[PDB]
Amino acid sequence: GPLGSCSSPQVEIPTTYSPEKIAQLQVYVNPIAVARDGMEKRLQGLIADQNWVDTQTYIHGPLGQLRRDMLGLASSLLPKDQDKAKTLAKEVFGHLERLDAAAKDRNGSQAKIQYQEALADFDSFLNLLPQAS
Template sequence: MLNLRPIFALILVVVTTFLVSCSSGQVSAPPPTYTLEKLESIQKFVSPIESSRQYLSKLQALIDSENWVDARTLIHGPLGQLRRDMSYLSRELLPQDQAQATQLIKDLFNDLEGLDAQAKARNYSFAVQKYNDAVRDFDSFLKLIPKSEGIS
């Protein structure tokens, strides 16, 4: 009598190979987008961050008048909460935007730390340079935030 077990195994391998090769493959998922709930959650963090942008304008006036003590106070005071708020918001962004947002936050606070050091040293030209870098990074971060039309 013939041993049928190897023949059945061979048939099973052939059928499995045929079924796998004829399958439709992966179904491409639509790219991730912001849901209404996610946009509402993001908007909770946007207000304090956008209001901090006004402090940067005040900081520029303090640097221009070489008021170093008040400039350092502004960096450590009202702008001190900015890192936390920006970090919370960056976690709400889409995965492809999170890495860039995190890097911009790091760059911004490196700029602010450099600005603080230049203000302590009373070095106007480097303070202005660090201020401009900070504003550029801050504005780049704001561009990553999705705009929500009609959400109240």
Template structure:
């Protein structure tokens, strides 16, 4: 009789454990959103990045004119500052967007290095193709930003 009680107790404990683990309320977690502080920080750096993006034709003209000194000044000045501002924005992005943003910033840096190497060898084709890629990286980065920050700047 004692053996049957212990076996019945074991079965009841297992059944209770199973029911407790399967049951219970499920808590729906809200998707991550940006805080007003994060939006404010992003908006602080955004105009500088957009200003450089809007100067893309200026850099292309410098390359086409073989004005290599000013090409170097442009990529080491405004373009490098835009990349720096991108790195300041990355920690304020949502966690799932940060790795992609870091990769885009790294790609932009690599394209700037390629442009710099092209200026040393006066290679217009290499410089132009990497310029196009660098500005595409800026656009890709801007696409990762929250709508509130990009629409606030546009409007």
């Protein structure tokens, strides 16, 4: 009889990134680093100036693709980090929606807290990258 095994191949978990995998990941990191830098520079200042109208446009425009980008990055990580990274992508989106609502409410204290919480979870996510090790 046929010699091949019919059992599930258990090609186990990689726990380091190959250059391929790292170049592939970089395709998502690029726009995500742009968004992280823009949140630090421009969005911060817009909140500080109580410029609520431009705050909201910033979230919808420059950050409008960030959920999609982070979710694509997350699904590309080592299996070990995929779920945590996905959960963090969803947390950042959540704080940006709470941010947009604070801008609508012209509540600068609430806006600053959601901005900080969005950055804390964004930086948590970024710390899963081979860049932070």
